[PDB]
């Protein structure tokens, strides 16, 4: 709840597309990032369906863990998964209420915690 992470993302909407074709592209985008054929910022501009964050180079700003407003839009699983990642990670595709996200954690201020 005081844990905060700053994140950028590439959002892959599934509106009027097949979920499988969308996830396949997201996985391939990620592999092209890994092999340095494209950068994260390049992938954001070319592929992200989130116009508002795309206009900020993908930046969503700071999210607090369990933030209700962020939990309500994208789901508790999305918020929870972002906080599973460490600063500088670019994530595997994350499912949410709207489609799939490739997330980069650009900043992180959070207490270490066990898994129960």
mmCIF file of C-alpha atoms in Angstrom:
data_model
loop_
_atom_site.group_PDB
_atom_site.id
_atom_site.type_symbol
_atom_site.label_atom_id
_atom_site.label_comp_id
_atom_site.label_asym_id
_atom_site.label_seq_id
_atom_site.Cartn_x
_atom_site.Cartn_y
_atom_site.Cartn_z
ATOM 1 C CA UNK A 1 0.000 0.000 0.000
ATOM 2 C CA UNK A 2 2.998 2.305 0.489
ATOM 3 C CA UNK A 3 4.799 0.004 -1.958
ATOM 4 C CA UNK A 4 4.996 1.930 -5.229
ATOM 5 C CA UNK A 5 6.374 1.068 -8.654
ATOM 6 C CA UNK A 6 6.729 3.310 -11.685
ATOM 7 C CA UNK A 7 5.930 1.374 -14.861
ATOM 8 C CA UNK A 8 5.785 1.745 -18.630
ATOM 9 C CA UNK A 9 3.845 -0.659 -20.767
ATOM 10 C CA UNK A 10 2.908 -1.813 -24.226
ATOM 11 C CA UNK A 11 -0.815 -2.533 -24.219
ATOM 12 C CA UNK A 12 -2.216 -5.156 -26.635
ATOM 13 C CA UNK A 13 -5.991 -4.777 -26.811
ATOM 14 C CA UNK A 14 -8.079 -7.761 -27.861
ATOM 15 C CA UNK A 15 -11.029 -5.692 -29.137
ATOM 16 C CA UNK A 16 -12.187 -7.251 -32.430
ATOM 17 C CA UNK A 17 -9.089 -9.479 -32.548
ATOM 18 C CA UNK A 18 -8.557 -13.095 -31.526
ATOM 19 C CA UNK A 19 -6.944 -13.381 -28.094
ATOM 20 C CA UNK A 20 -4.515 -15.969 -29.482
ATOM 21 C CA UNK A 21 -3.290 -13.728 -32.287
ATOM 22 C CA UNK A 22 -2.811 -10.908 -29.769
ATOM 23 C CA UNK A 23 -0.839 -12.973 -27.269
ATOM 24 C CA UNK A 24 1.314 -14.427 -30.057
ATOM 25 C CA UNK A 25 2.294 -10.938 -31.193
ATOM 26 C CA UNK A 26 3.075 -9.854 -27.633
ATOM 27 C CA UNK A 27 5.302 -12.890 -27.135
ATOM 28 C CA UNK A 28 7.085 -12.190 -30.422
ATOM 29 C CA UNK A 29 7.509 -8.495 -29.554
ATOM 30 C CA UNK A 30 9.114 -9.563 -26.301
ATOM 31 C CA UNK A 31 11.498 -11.966 -28.073
ATOM 32 C CA UNK A 32 12.500 -9.206 -30.495
ATOM 33 C CA UNK A 33 13.252 -6.958 -27.525
ATOM 34 C CA UNK A 34 15.361 -9.736 -25.933
ATOM 35 C CA UNK A 35 17.404 -10.187 -29.100
ATOM 36 C CA UNK A 36 17.792 -6.377 -29.393
ATOM 37 C CA UNK A 37 16.131 -6.268 -32.827
ATOM 38 C CA UNK A 38 13.820 -3.575 -31.395
ATOM 39 C CA UNK A 39 13.834 -1.418 -28.288
ATOM 40 C CA UNK A 40 11.093 -1.180 -25.686
ATOM 41 C CA UNK A 41 10.350 2.426 -26.713
ATOM 42 C CA UNK A 42 10.170 1.358 -30.354
ATOM 43 C CA UNK A 43 7.722 -1.431 -29.488
ATOM 44 C CA UNK A 44 5.622 1.027 -27.476
ATOM 45 C CA UNK A 45 5.288 3.473 -30.348
ATOM 46 C CA UNK A 46 4.629 0.831 -32.988
ATOM 47 C CA UNK A 47 2.440 -1.641 -31.082
ATOM 48 C CA UNK A 48 0.875 -0.122 -27.964
ATOM 49 C CA UNK A 49 -2.899 0.353 -28.133
ATOM 50 C CA UNK A 50 -2.898 2.635 -25.051
ATOM 51 C CA UNK A 51 -2.727 6.037 -26.721
ATOM 52 C CA UNK A 52 -2.438 8.053 -23.488
ATOM 53 C CA UNK A 53 0.660 6.278 -22.169
ATOM 54 C CA UNK A 54 2.086 5.763 -25.672
ATOM 55 C CA UNK A 55 2.204 9.579 -25.898
ATOM 56 C CA UNK A 56 4.437 9.460 -22.792
ATOM 57 C CA UNK A 57 6.748 6.781 -24.192
ATOM 58 C CA UNK A 58 4.702 4.123 -22.397
ATOM 59 C CA UNK A 59 4.958 5.639 -18.917
ATOM 60 C CA UNK A 60 1.971 5.004 -16.655
ATOM 61 C CA UNK A 61 3.514 6.827 -13.680
ATOM 62 C CA UNK A 62 3.566 5.490 -10.133
ATOM 63 C CA UNK A 63 1.209 2.695 -9.056
ATOM 64 C CA UNK A 64 0.767 1.702 -5.413
ATOM 65 C CA UNK A 65 0.265 -1.961 -4.594
ATOM 66 C CA UNK A 66 -3.387 -2.780 -4.069
ATOM 67 C CA UNK A 67 -4.389 0.669 -5.366
ATOM 68 C CA UNK A 68 -8.157 0.278 -5.762
ATOM 69 C CA UNK A 69 -8.385 2.575 -8.787
ATOM 70 C CA UNK A 70 -5.695 0.599 -10.623
ATOM 71 C CA UNK A 71 -7.038 -2.708 -9.300
ATOM 72 C CA UNK A 72 -10.518 -1.831 -10.576
ATOM 73 C CA UNK A 73 -9.473 -0.975 -14.135
ATOM 74 C CA UNK A 74 -6.981 -3.778 -14.861
ATOM 75 C CA UNK A 75 -7.647 -6.323 -12.102
ATOM 76 C CA UNK A 76 -5.972 -7.371 -8.884
ATOM 77 C CA UNK A 77 -3.890 -9.872 -10.870
ATOM 78 C CA UNK A 78 -2.337 -7.188 -13.067
ATOM 79 C CA UNK A 79 -1.391 -4.903 -10.157
ATOM 80 C CA UNK A 80 -0.127 -7.890 -8.169
ATOM 81 C CA UNK A 81 1.963 -9.182 -11.093
ATOM 82 C CA UNK A 82 3.653 -5.825 -11.738
ATOM 83 C CA UNK A 83 4.888 -5.865 -8.141
ATOM 84 C CA UNK A 84 6.292 -9.365 -8.728
ATOM 85 C CA UNK A 85 8.783 -7.756 -11.113
ATOM 86 C CA UNK A 86 12.010 -6.035 -10.154
ATOM 87 C CA UNK A 87 13.286 -2.664 -11.306
ATOM 88 C CA UNK A 88 14.499 -2.811 -14.888
ATOM 89 C CA UNK A 89 12.524 -5.955 -15.755
ATOM 90 C CA UNK A 90 10.512 -6.097 -18.955
ATOM 91 C CA UNK A 91 7.783 -8.629 -18.243
ATOM 92 C CA UNK A 92 6.397 -11.553 -20.140
ATOM 93 C CA UNK A 93 2.896 -10.718 -21.404
ATOM 94 C CA UNK A 94 0.510 -10.017 -18.495
ATOM 95 C CA UNK A 95 -3.202 -10.667 -18.905
ATOM 96 C CA UNK A 96 -5.639 -8.038 -17.656
ATOM 97 C CA UNK A 97 -9.306 -7.126 -17.990
ATOM 98 C CA UNK A 98 -8.604 -5.396 -21.329
ATOM 99 C CA UNK A 99 -5.987 -7.475 -23.140
ATOM 100 C CA UNK A 100 -2.281 -8.142 -22.582
ATOM 101 C CA UNK A 101 0.512 -5.893 -21.290
ATOM 102 C CA UNK A 102 4.259 -5.966 -21.611
ATOM 103 C CA UNK A 103 5.402 -4.010 -18.540
ATOM 104 C CA UNK A 104 8.745 -2.388 -17.752
ATOM 105 C CA UNK A 105 9.446 -1.506 -14.122
ATOM 106 C CA UNK A 106 11.374 1.765 -14.286
ATOM 107 C CA UNK A 107 11.351 2.568 -10.554
ATOM 108 C CA UNK A 108 10.443 0.557 -7.472
ATOM 109 C CA UNK A 109 10.071 1.463 -3.792
ATOM 110 C CA UNK A 110 8.682 -1.562 -1.953
ATOM 111 C CA UNK A 111 9.407 -3.616 1.141
ATOM 112 C CA UNK A 112 10.759 -7.142 0.669
ATOM 113 C CA UNK A 113 8.120 -9.685 1.683
ATOM 114 C CA UNK A 114 7.862 -13.445 2.038
ATOM 115 C CA UNK A 115 5.315 -15.503 0.110
ATOM 116 C CA UNK A 116 2.887 -17.144 2.543
#
